[PDB]
RNA sequence: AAGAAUGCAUUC
């Protein structure tokens, strides 16, 4: 039947002038045959077998051939009133007028308007069945902070502890409708940013122009941002949303943090191991870092980073003058003579003078997923050899410092990871640098200690490759058995703890770390 | 391990 309605959207699409109407109309028609569709597919799942089960593929083919195809149609409007407006300026600048062009801010508007329509049609859609999936059918593995961050209430509705084969289906399409929401706001915020803002005015079309666009618009995608990290929240094993926030983040030329998300993309433990993966070789191939680092190495520039953008792009290129030696490696140099070692010098005094736990949590994250993707061992091996370099210089911080959820990560990275355990405890700095830190800290446990939930770590981490879908330092056999899934998300707001959460969870990351150091000391 | 060059690192 998809194909059905897809065959005559194409048709309707395709015509010369487009019945605004027509198309909200039969949008509207469609959209109330799949819902009682679904509705019905899920009542009588337990009638057919399994396989069957059709509505995971129907729904990912509404979404891909009838709902995407009606916004990149709109998206095509806008872009051909934008080409217009470029072609009338040209032209007022050929004629030597160039005073009298003007931007027409009619029939951007009206495109728009019915594109927002359009948009406001399918984000209500997609609500009603999240809302339906989530409330209709007892899940235990729904955390509560999904469900209060939509208010939702689950009535005494249908408990399927039956099927946890259907439970995972319906997650699944809740998943699916929270990518779909996060994704349509995505493409409008970009819409709204490149083609409408810019037909807005003279001063607008400009700043737009000359500016490629410096792009602080960040502020227009945190509701689509906020929807992926429901879907993580919901499946993190699923790579799509953490793809997709990197496309944000590179569309606002946030390089680093684009690499970031197209790395946790790669590595969740259900990813295609495409989408990511690609991206981020494209942004490394361009000359966006090397541009910046000669930015920042002349010192005068217009560009203007922060001290963290500052080590983050330190951090690409001489991640890259080992991985992407064609781009980032001219000799000692890694572009126009600034020597290799003179930047590495630069950003490991950085690392204490500019101490953050998320910057360094992003950077190892970084450097030991280019580490994962190398394939030749010399290059492995000298990657290796850098980021044990950073690792020395963060244990040297620690030293005097607090980064009590870096040296966790640090410890579990170690942990999961026998060649990078091994390398780690063959370096005498290593060993000599950590047992100085492992020394600061005091603590009775001899054990994995066991606690009342997962920190914002475990969280962050939940099902990446790089420390095994999890950290083991901890026994959280009673956090794994659910009948309850809040503890997993963190979410201590049931537990009786008041201001002293922070004290709690600083004293067991010490007993972790305490005795998980030990234990790799011991090796 | 040396030896050489560039700013402990990088390069042959
Ligand atoms: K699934
Ligand atoms: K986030
Ligand atoms: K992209
Ligand atoms: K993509
Ligand atoms: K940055
Ligand atoms: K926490």
Redesign the pocket.
């Given at each position: 039947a998809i194909r059905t309605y897809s065959t005559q959207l194409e048709e309707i699409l395709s015509r010369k002038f487009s019945d605004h109407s027509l198309l909200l109309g039969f949008n509207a028609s469609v959209q109330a045959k799949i819902y009682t569709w679904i509705v019905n597919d899920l009542d009588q799942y337990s009638k057919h077998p399994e396989m069957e089960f059709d509505a995971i593929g129907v729904f990912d083919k509404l979404w891909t051939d009838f709902h995407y195809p009606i916004i990149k149609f709109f998206q095509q409007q806008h872009a051909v009133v934008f080409e217009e407006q470029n072609r009338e300026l040209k032209k007022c600048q050929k004629e030597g007028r160039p005073g009298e062009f003007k931007v027409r801010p009619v029939e951007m508007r009206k495109i728009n308007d019915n594109f927002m329509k359009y948009i406001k049609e399918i984000y209500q859609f997609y609500g009603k069945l999240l809302k339906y999936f989530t409330t209709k059918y007892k899940n235990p593995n729904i955390p509560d902070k999904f469900l209060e961050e939509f208010r939702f209430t689950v009535s005494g509705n249908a408990i399927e502890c039956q099927d946890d084969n259907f439970l995972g289906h319906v997650i699944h399409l809740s998943h699916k409708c929270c990518l779909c929401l996060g994704d349509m706001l995505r493409n409008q915020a970009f819409i709204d940013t490149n083609y409408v803002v810019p037909c807005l005015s003279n001063k607008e079309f400009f700043k737009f122009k000359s500016s490629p666009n410096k792009r602080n618009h960040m502020g227009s995608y945190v509701k689509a941002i906020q929807y992926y990290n429901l879907c993580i929240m919901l499946i993190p094993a699923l790579s799509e949303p953490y793809n997709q926030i990197?496309?944000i983040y590179?569309?606002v030329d946030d390089k680093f943090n684009?690499i970031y998300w197209?790395l946790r993309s790669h590595f969740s433990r259900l990813s295609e191991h495409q989408l990511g993966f690609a991206?981020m070789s494209?942004?490394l191939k361009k000359h966006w870092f090397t541009t910046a680092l000669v930015d920042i190495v002349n010192g005068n520039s217009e560009r203007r980073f922060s001290n963290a953008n500052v080590m983050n792009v330190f951090l690409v290129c001489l991640l890259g003058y080992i991985y992407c030696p064609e781009r980032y490696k001219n000799g000692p140099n890694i572009v126009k003579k600034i020597p290799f070692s003179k930047i590495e010098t630069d950003l490991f005094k950085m690392i204490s003078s500019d101490f953050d736990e998320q910057v360094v949590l992003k950077h190892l994250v970084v450097m030991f997923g280019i580490v994962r993707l190398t394939r030749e061992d010399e290059q492995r091996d000298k990657l290796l050899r850098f980021a044990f370099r950073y690792v020395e210089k963060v244990l040297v911080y620690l030293k005097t410092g607090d980064g009590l959820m870096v040296l966790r990560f640090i410890l579990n990275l170690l942990r999961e990871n026998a060649p990078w355990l091994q390398v780690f405890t063959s370096r005498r700095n290593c060993v000599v640098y950590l047992t100085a830190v492992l020394k600061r800290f005091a603590s009775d446990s001899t054990t994995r200690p066991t606690r009342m939930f997962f920190f914002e770590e475990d969280v962050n981490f939940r099902d990446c490759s790089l420390i095994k879908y999890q950290f083991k330092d901890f026994n959280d056999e009673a956090l794994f058995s659910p009948y309850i899934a809040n503890m997993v998300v963190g979410d201590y707001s049931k537990c009786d703890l008041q201001d002293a959460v922070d004290e709690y969870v600083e004293r067991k990351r010490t007993d972790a770390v305490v005795v998980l150091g030990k234990k790799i000391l011991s090796g």
């Open positions: 990197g496309v590179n569309s684009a197209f991206n494209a942004i």
